[PDB]
Paper text:
Purine nucleoside phosphorylase (PNP) (E.C 2.4.2.1) is an enzyme responsible for reversible phosphorolysis of purine nucleosides, generating ribose-1-phosphate and their corresponding bases. Here, we characterize a newly identified isoform of S. mansoni PNP (SmPNP2) employing a combination of methodologies: ligand discovery by thermofluorescence, kinetic assays, high-performance liquid chromatography (HPLC) and X-ray crystallography. The crystal structure reveals this property appears to be related to the substitutions in the active site that induce the locking of the gate loop.
Numbering used by the authors:
A (entry chain A), B (entry chain A), C (entry chain A): 4 to 287
């Protein structure tokens, strides 16, 4: 049933270290349609999940499932190609293990993107939101990704999340957007985690507006919590597919096809942005 | 462990088709104490769940468990006699399969009733509420009925719920209430799904009032989401057992005995109402 | 998989009755660092959980796990030394069984303490809060401790929680605080149940403030609901470790070390308080 413990994560890391010969400092997890950066991986090594000891089985959902290692912007990185989402039914242990493997591989910074709905009236389709905090409905409701025995080797029983979204990384991301004159697309905000897989209902959207949420999505918070637990710094950026409040007012529906079209519209800019961020990251 | 997939649903539908010789266009799921309509089933065929391949086992909870087919108001219908509720511990797969069997049987419209608590100050015991939207706390909290692999043959990975409660069906229900001069009992509103089985606490009721909820109950939203996913139109009506906000202000308790007494008070009127709705439904 | 049913609870109670020769009227469950009262147990009998038929296995988490019986303040009591929390991954059945064993042993009143975060601006580190109601996010989200088959021998399918926190017991606790001149430390309030194990995020804290929550913690509500279901009266007291709203405004982190330091600061006073409450409890 593979628990995301020290022994099991170590066995996966040992396999990866041997096969790739890359020691990554940075990890990357991408939103759907936002995977182009993994094409710029120089000296790349592709490792199917299915080959890695103790990695989660992903064949029921299918589609791509690779760990990709190599160099971006002069830095060594490890990327997940084929993301695990909790609405697919993956367990807490299955979500946690690949991030803890990143930790054992030497990852100190995790960069994450996702697609999400805009709740704040200021947000438009195609905007970026630097996530500065979250409202974790699964966590409040006994489905926190850390429910279960604590793995002491990685972190504490009761983590504090007040610094889960690194302030310096947010400031660096904004700086680079300003230098390249697309800062008008960049916002900061609070992310509500909707477990999914149904989109927020119109009345759910309205409730989230009342509760001080700026953005809503079905991902990212579980990964953030596992990273924070084991001391990995996180930058999380949402690409806004739509404004759910406006759509509710106008009786307009959300669909994944529209979402992917927005991802295609911004994928190249997001790639350029994150490549520069990687280049500008501290060597420490 | 029977997954609610295409193959398993097909095997159940094939058994039912053979035994009943009825091709239903309408499905019906009833609230507790609101099952009288299933007595007007003409040319009826009763099929115990326990006889149907792949139907959920319900013997731990016990009580009645039949699929009933036949004719109401000149239309062919299929009804669940003995409802599956998620607070009993049924899985996502167990809730989903009977609705997907309805889909394969040919159901295009699902009519659902339930008993619920009033939050909106305008609501009194014995009132009806046409549900026009919902706040799905289990869904926000990673217990959405669709969590797990998607069954592509039935619907999309990410459904939009903005039209989950059919507007035309709401308007028809209200029209019939007006013709029979009981429209003063009929409201529209937003339904909060409390997983249950404890009634909303007084402070939970107060919170729901702040969040724009009109009614709260422990059912119906899972069925609505499975129906919406596979393209079945839904009319959902709550019978109000009590006003939870007033009861909290007056330190008055809710109990199931009082709830069933309200169901008995309105069961015959609800039967007449729904029979007329069935008669007036489009042939398409 | 041991269900918390009548037969299984009876087997545990029969073992305990034989080994201890104590018939307790009062049960006690303590917050972390607040276990000193279990040192004043006169004529004490210590029974490891691992020896009791059908008790939950707790070796993965480890640490102490004893049932302690004996006399406090002239009354016969049973205490849990080593508390089961749902964020550890224990099931509904594992949480419920020890409280139902208390019921079969003859417990009529359950006294519970916990450590929690202050949301209400009036609350300071070291304050006590008499819990008068709750917001149960796991319950709203389909993780209520009673989800599953109902055990009819203990209580009803649909409990009402409006009297879950006994008013007379709250008044008695306050009276004793007044007599001993520490009533300035004592508040009353509404408790939000955060499943855990991560502390409330700063934005979650802000949301809880908007929703009328006074205190937030990761315990106690499951035990309250099982006790209420089987007719045991409850007094629940939170010791405030910090004010989460102030900490968010000042960018100050919460950690368990700080929490335990507050418990140490108030443990002796809480012991004296609860011993007096036990002495003053009705003989009925």
């Amino acid at each position: 049933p593979v628990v995301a413990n020290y022994e099991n994560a170590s066995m996966a890391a040992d396999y990866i270290k041997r096969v790739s010969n890359v020691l990554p400092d940075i990890g990357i997890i991408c939103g759907s349609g936002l995977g182009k950066l993994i094409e710029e991986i120089e000296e790349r090594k592709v490792i199917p999940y299915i080959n890695i000891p103790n990695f989660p089985k992903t064949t029921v959902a299918g589609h791509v499932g690779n760990l990709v290692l190599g160099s971006v912007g002069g830095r060594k990185i490890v990327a997940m190609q084929g993301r695990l989402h909790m609405y697919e039914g993956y367990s807490n242990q299955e979500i946690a293990l690949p991030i803890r493997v990143m930790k054992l591989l030497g990852v100190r910074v995790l960069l994450i993107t996702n697609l999400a709905g805009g709740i704040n009236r200021k947000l438009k389709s195609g905007d970026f939101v630097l996530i500065k905090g979250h409202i974790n409905f699964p966590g409040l409701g006994l489905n926190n990704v850390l429910v279960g025995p604590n793995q002491d080797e990685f972190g504490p029983r009761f983590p504090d999340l007040s610094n889960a979204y690194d302030r310096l990384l947010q400031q660096l991301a904004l700086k680079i957007a300003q230098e390249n004159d697309f800062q008008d697309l960049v916002h900061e905000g609070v992310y509500a985690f909707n477990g999914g897989p149904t989109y927020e209902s119109p009345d759910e959207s309205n409730m989230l507006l009342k509760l001080g949420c700026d953005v809503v999505g079905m991902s990212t918070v579980p990964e953030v919590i596992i990273a924070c637990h084991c001391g990995i710094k996180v930058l999380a950026v949402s690409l806004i597919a739509n404004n759910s409040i406006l759509d509710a007012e106008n009786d307009v529906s959300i669909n994944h096809e529209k979402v992917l079209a927005v991802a295609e519209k911004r994928a190249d800019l997001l790639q350029m942005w994150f490549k520069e961020i990687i280049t500008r990251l501290p060597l420490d």
